[PDB]
C-alpha cells in the first residue's frame, strides 16, 4: 500500500527517535513518496502523527476486548488492563513522542481538542470497567469519569516511567497499584 | 565557582533555547571559561546537563524539607507533595529542556543509569512519608519501597498526561487520587 506504508514508516521513526527528531524528509527516503503525497491524506505533520495515535489507540482497544474475556469480574478486568498495558505493542510505546509533541504544540489551539477527543478513547476502558462494576455491585463509584481519568493517567505513568527495570518488576508493581487503587474505591 | 558560573550560565541557556539548541561554545564564552575547563568538569554536554538536574533535585529537596513543616501528619504530607508536584511543573523553567533531554537520551544505559539515581531521589520523599507514616500508625505498609515507587510514578503520570485540562480540574483530580490511594492502604 502507500497511504498505509507511510503511516507505518512514521510510527517506527516516531518510536525509535522522537516526534521532532523524525522529519517528513526522513519518512520519505524509507517510504518512497513525493513530499506532496504526504499532503493530501495528511495535512500537517501533527496530522500524520495525530493520525497514528488514533490507529494505535484503536488497535489497542481492540486487542483488549478480544482479551478481557479472560477476566470474569471487572475487578479482574481492571487488574488485567493495567498488566496488559505493560506488554502490548500498541499506543503506549508512543507515550514518549506524545509527551514531546504536546510540548511543541500546546501553544496552538487545534491541540487541546484532538489531544482531548482522543483522551475519551484512552479512558473509555476504565469508564466501562468502572460503570459496569457499579452496575454489578463490585464497588460504588460516584465520580466515574474522575476515577477513570485518574486511573488511566496513573497507569500510563507506571507503564511509562519505569520503562527499563526488568519487565517482571513492572508487572509486580502494576498489580500492587491495581490492588491499592481498588481497595481505595470501596 | 567558575564551575558554578558554568552551571549557572548553562542552566539559563538551557531554559531559553532548550537542550539540543544550546552549544558548549555559548556556555564557554558566556561563562568566560574554556572548552578545556568545561571538559574537565563535565566531559560532555549531556553530563553537564545531568549535573544541573542534580543541583535542581537538591534545591527541590531543600525546598520540600521546608515546605513540609506545613503538613503536620504524613497523610497531609502525601496530599501536599502531590499537589506541589503538579502545580510547580506548570511553571518549571527547565521542564522543556528536560523533556527534550529524556526523549532523546533514554536509550543510552550510562545516561539512563544516572537518571535513575536521580529519579530515586525523588522517590525517597515518598519513601520517607510512608516509613514515617508507619511509625505513627497513620497506615500500615510492609512494602514501603513498592508503594513509594508506585505513588511516584502514578503521580507523575497524573502530572504529565493531563496538561489539556484547566489547572483547577487537575488539582481536583490529583487530590482525589491522593484520597483513593491513601484510602486503599487500610
Ligand atoms: N528530572 C527532573 C530532575 C530534577 C527536577 C527538579 C525539579 C524541581 C522543581 C520542579 N518543579 C520540577 C522539577 N523537576 C525535575 C525533574
UniProtKB/Swiss-Prot annotation, chains A, B:
UniProt keyword annotations, A-Z: DNA-binding, Plasmid, Repressor, Transcription, Transcription regulation
Every HTH tetR-type domain range: 1-60
DNA-binding region as annotated in the record: 23-42
Effect of residue 71 to A: Almost no loss of activity
GO aspect biological process, one term: negative regulation of DNA-templated transcription
Any Pfam family the entry gives: TetR_N
The keyword Transcription regulation is annotated on this UniProt entry: yes
InterPro entries xrefs: DNA-bd_HTH_TetR-type_CS (IPR023772), Homeodomain-like_sf (IPR009057), HTH-type_Tx_Regulator (IPR050624), HTH_TetR (IPR001647), Tet_transcr_reg_TetR-rel_C_sf (IPR036271), Tscrpt_reg_QacR_C (IPR013571)
Function: Transcriptional repressor of qacA. Binds to IR1, an unusually long 28 bp operator, which is located downstream from the qacA promoter and overlaps its transcription start site. QacR is induced from its IR1 site by binding to one of many structurally dissimilar cationic lipophilic compounds, which are also substrates of QacA.
Protein name per Swiss-Prot or TrEMBL: HTH-type transcriptional regulator QacR
Organism listed in the record: Staphylococcus aureus
Species lineage: Bacteria, Bacillati, Bacillota, Bacilli, Bacillales
Name of encoding gene: qacR
Amino acid at each position: 500500500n502507500l497511504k498505509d506504508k507511510i503511516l507505518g514508516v512514521a510510527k517506527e521513526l516516531f518510536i525509535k527517535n522522537g516526534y521532532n527528531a523524525t522529519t517528513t524528509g526522513e519518512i520519505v527516503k524509507l517510504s518512497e513518496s513525493s513530499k506532496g503525497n504526504l499532503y493530501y491524506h495528511f495535512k500537517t505533520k501533527e496530522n500524520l502523527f495525530l493520525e497514528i495515535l488514533n490507529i494505535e489507540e484503536s488497535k489497542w482497544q481492540e486487542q483488549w476486548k478480544k482479551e478481557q474475556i479472560k477476566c470474569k469480574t471487572n475487578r479482574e478486568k481492571f487488574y488485567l488492563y493495567n498488566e496488559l498495558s505493560l506488554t502490548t505493542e500498541y499506543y503506549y510505546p508512543l507515550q514518549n513522542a506524545i509527551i514531546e509533541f504536546y510540548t511543541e504544540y500546546y501553544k496552538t489551539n487545534s491541540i487541546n481538542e484532538k489531544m482531548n477527543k482522543l483522551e475519551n478513547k484512552y479512558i473509555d476502558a476504565y469508564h466501562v470497567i468502572f460503570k459496569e462494576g457499579n452496575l454489578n455491585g463490585e464497588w460504588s463509584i460516584n465520580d466515574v469519569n474522575a476515577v477513570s481519568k485518574i486511573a488511566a493517567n496513573a497507569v500510563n505513568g507506571i507503564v511509562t516511567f519505569t520503562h527499563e527495570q526488568n519487565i517482571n518488576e513492572r508487572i509486580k508493581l502494576m498489580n500492587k497499584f491495581s490492588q491499592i487503587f481498588l481497595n481505595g474505591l470501596s
